[PDB]
Amino acid sequence: KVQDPFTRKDWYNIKAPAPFAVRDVGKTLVNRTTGLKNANDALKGRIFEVCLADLQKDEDHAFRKIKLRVDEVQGKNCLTNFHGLDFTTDKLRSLVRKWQTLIEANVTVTTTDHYLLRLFAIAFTKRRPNQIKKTTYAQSSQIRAIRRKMVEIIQREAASCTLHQLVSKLIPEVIGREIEKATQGIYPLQNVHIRKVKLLKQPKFDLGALMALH
Amino acid sequence: LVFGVARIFASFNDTFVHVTDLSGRETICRVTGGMKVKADRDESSPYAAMLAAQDVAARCKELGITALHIKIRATGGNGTKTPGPGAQSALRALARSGMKIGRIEDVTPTPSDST
Amino acid sequence: LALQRLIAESHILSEAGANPSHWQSSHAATTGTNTRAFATGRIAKKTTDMRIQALGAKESILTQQKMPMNMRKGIVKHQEEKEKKRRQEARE
Amino acid sequence: EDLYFLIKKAVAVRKHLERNRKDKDSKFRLILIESRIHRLARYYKTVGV
Amino acid sequence: ESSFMTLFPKYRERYLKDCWPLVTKALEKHGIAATLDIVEGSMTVKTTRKTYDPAAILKARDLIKLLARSVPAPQALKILEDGMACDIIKIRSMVRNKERFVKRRQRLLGQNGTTLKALELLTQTYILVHGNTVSVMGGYKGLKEVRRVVEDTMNNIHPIYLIKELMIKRELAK
RNA sequence: UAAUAGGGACAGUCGGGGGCGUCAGUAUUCAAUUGUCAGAGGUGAAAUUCUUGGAUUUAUUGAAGACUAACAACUGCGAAAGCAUUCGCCAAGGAUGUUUUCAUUAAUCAGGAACGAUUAGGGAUCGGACGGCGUUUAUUUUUGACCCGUUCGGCACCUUACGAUAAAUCAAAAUGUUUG
């Protein structure tokens, strides 16, 4: 068959909110809506992963990709809010240094809007100043103690401050610094990063909270 | 400044260039490595990446794309995590043909468990 | 036979130029002692000497037998210092 | 004395294996402590008790 | 300012510290600026606008990966040709016994590296054994055949039989 | 005599030691939904093979098998084959220290059984205990990471052997050339 899709496919718009400092993020060419398979599943159900360096305009943030569930469609418009986040693969390669400890935790959280969000997190042992030893190893009960201080601090500053305040706490890494200065009483633990945040199903479609984000 | 996503999946025998939108749903133009030179031997060659690279890039500029974000991978399941001779010449010819790219980053599927 | 010559003669045939990937060998391809107009027979001398050493020889023609002892201790000291530096750089 | 902590430890390991009889290295800890039961039961029986 | 980074250890610090201007000379010829972070101790490469070849930053990420993996800096800077490509082969989970696996990795190395360099002269590639990994640089056919070699070596076939097979292959290339 | 030989009690611990269960993680295969739309591929040359119902590929889910990559060590645990996500439970076990006790219980192995006396010190390795002519936690007391000394206990390197001797084996094959 000669299918050739030039006329039936259109150039939608995908746009950026107020906390994402750029104006536009995408101009996305998918398919024209019409009867016999209307476009709401070929629309909104798509997710949309881009870097944050152009979004908050600081190009030092070339890591930390985000997924974005499409949620608001007008004709020749879209406006996309925060759904997913994952750390960048070669930088989670670039933080693995031999002779100290990598720390993993897979925390399951839900927000008071019953938002099922996991927080996959990885921290790294700091080699102290004035240290001539080639190692900085931990003691595995010290690692366990680190990790219930980890889920202690993420449970202490989780279960509140909903997604405007939550991703407004995620992107300028307040979680990392509160893990750092909270957990350095036991063990120094620099390079605290938040590898993945997992939403699976946003339970609603509703436009009031979406325009409350916009 | 319209941007897209140009993707490369280049084994030791074949090269894939696959342009999709900024989410990854809508296939704009894909050309396999054998739709090029059509010798039955060296389908991963940098000349095949030259033909597929100039073909997909110059075609999509007639579709007016004006920028691309390239992801690069080989058969990272149980083979190598390094592409064949198609990714260097595909990024070379897509690069030197007209268009403009900002950041470059590649994603390769690490098995954290396999054997 | 010829494979014993391959694995045995590999540091010399590889020391000449025959691996353009390897840095010592493709440095040695344009070092100067193989860009002189007569090199494959120099290395053929060394490999036929290695063959006779396989055929039951204790001494080579290739070695200088008599040295003024401070040249000699400097050379053997230098080989031992190189290999000691290599084995202390094999803890990487 | 010592013998009561020996039989507390030993019957405790026996109760552990009676909760799972497929832990064969802890079964080796059982045959170690049973060998100590044969040992100190033998010697401290030959003391006169 | 497209920046990649990878991380080196404190023993590698010195050799990078005075091999580094040969590296950043060899990449300032490609315009890719690069620095060593001395206090943290990391390797930063980044492109400005002046890269004629945007494939060279793939070459630079693969490069400083090969500098963190303890390869000599000329051998690392031979990634900047066309046919030369990095690879590693992981084998520590490929074979499940400890001391038998040491017997297999030094069966791969051999008597003073003679079987290793016979493999390198059959396959035109460079092979380095680093800890529990096997780095290998070169052309893609050589990378494939060397991966065949390391797999068949770890699954108990001797590299005298493998060098028999590869030399008979090179004689059957005509 | 409390033995510079016992087993245990107590304390802060320690171990990628074992058992039960849970918890994730990726990739592999399978199925569905699209965007698809002429090759994908398997290699030394080449073919079987999938392929106008779309195979390879892109994205998004679900189910199952595997294992716990990268930290992973000139280390740590366990006698062995072995031991790698988080968390809980179950018992053991090691090491240190004590102001703890029946006080010879000790040492080596036929019969049998389960699992598959110093070298001579130095520099590093942790697992404790004690001390600090020091930073940082810390809004300052705890406390912990770094640095130092003592100290034990082990896993290995190096030289000299304290010597050997059957040599290829050595801080043990030192005690088979003035043998007890």
> Angle at which helices E159-171 and E114-123 pack, to 10 degrees?
20
In one-letter notation, the amino acid at residue A133 is K
A104 CB neighbours strand F below 7 A:
yes
E130 CB neighbours strand F below 7 A:
no
Cβ-Cβ contacts under 8 Å, B110 against chain A: 89
Say which nucleotide is closest to residue A147, CA to C1' distance: F86
**E72 vs chain C: nearest CA distance in angstroms?**
9
Sign of CA dihedral A42, A45, A49, A52: positive
Do the Cβ atoms of B22 and A78 come closer than 8 Å? Answer: no
The whole-angstrom separation of Cα C68 and Cα C64 is 11
> How was this model experimentally determined?
cryo-EM
Q: Rounded to an integer, what is the distance from CA A19 to the centroid of its chain? A: 14
Phi-psi region of E112 (alpha: psi -120 to 50; beta: other; left: phi over 0): left
Q: Which residues pair with E135 in a beta bridge?
A: E88, E128
Q: Which residues pair with E160 in a beta bridge?
A: none
Phi-psi region of A54 (alpha: psi -120 to 50; beta: other; left: phi over 0): alpha
Measure Cα distances from A19 to A22, A23, A165, B75, C39 in Å.
Answer: 9, 10, 10, 38, 70
Give the residue from B40, B28, B35, B11 showing the smallest Cα distance to B67: B28
Do the Cβ atoms of E36 and E73 come closer than 8 Å? Answer: no
**E149 vs chain B: nearest CA distance in angstroms?**
14
In one-letter notation, the amino acid at residue E38 is I
DSSP assignment letter at B1: -
Do the Cβ atoms of D9 and D33 come closer than 8 Å? Answer: yes
End-to-end CA distance of chain D: 13
Residue A78, SS3 per DSSP: strand
Q: Which phi and psi (to 5°) does residue A82 adopt? A: -70, 125
Q: Rounded to an integer, what is the distance from CA B8 to the centroid of its chain? A: 3
Asked whether the beta carbons of residue B23 and residue A49 sit closer than 8 angstroms, the reply is yes
**Which residue among A62, A95, A98 places its CB closest to the CB of E9?**
A98
How many other CB atoms are found less than 10 A from the CB of residue C35? 11
Do the Cβ atoms of A121 and A102 come closer than 8 Å? Answer: no
The strand pair at B69-73 and B5-10 is best described as parallel
Residue found under tokens 């920028």: B67
The whole-angstrom separation of Cα C20 and Cα E134 is 19
The whole-angstrom separation of Cα D20 and Cα E40 is 51
Name the strand (E) or helix (H) holding B95.
Answer: helix B87-96
Annotate chain E with three-state secondary structure: CEEEEEECCCCHHHHHHCCHHHHHHHHHCCCEEEEEECCCCEEEEEECCCCCCCCHHHHHHHHHHHHHCCCCHHHHHHHHCCCCECCEEECCCCCCCHHHHHHHHHHHHCHHHHHHHHHHHHHCCEEEEECCEEEEEECHHHHHHHHHHHHHHHCCCCHHHHHHHHHHHHHCCC
Asked whether the beta carbons of residue A51 and residue B21 sit closer than 8 angstroms, the reply is no
Between residue 21 and residue 80 of chain A, the positions with Cβ below 7 Å from nucleic chain F are 31, 37, 41-42, 46-47, 49, 67
Sign of CA dihedral D40, D42, D47, D48: positive
The whole-angstrom separation of Cα B49 and Cα B33 is 7
Give the residue from B54, B46, B104, B106 showing the smallest Cα distance to B81: B106
How many other CB atoms are found less than 10 A from the CB of residue C59? 9
Give the residue from B97, B76, B100, B72 showing the smallest Cα distance to B85: B72
Give the residue from E18, E16, E20 showing the smallest Cα distance to E28: E20
Q: Which residues pair with C92 in a beta bridge?
A: none
Name the strand (E) or helix (H) holding A107.
Answer: strand A102-111
User: Strand order in E2-7's β-sheet?
Assistant: E2-7, E42-47, E32-37
Say which nucleotide is closest to residue D9, CA to C1' distance: F92
A191 CB neighbours strand F below 7 A:
no
Give the residue whose CA sits closest to F24 at C1'. Answer: A106
Q: Rounded to an integer, what is the distance from CA A159 to the centroid of its chain? A: 17
B40 labeled binding residue = yes
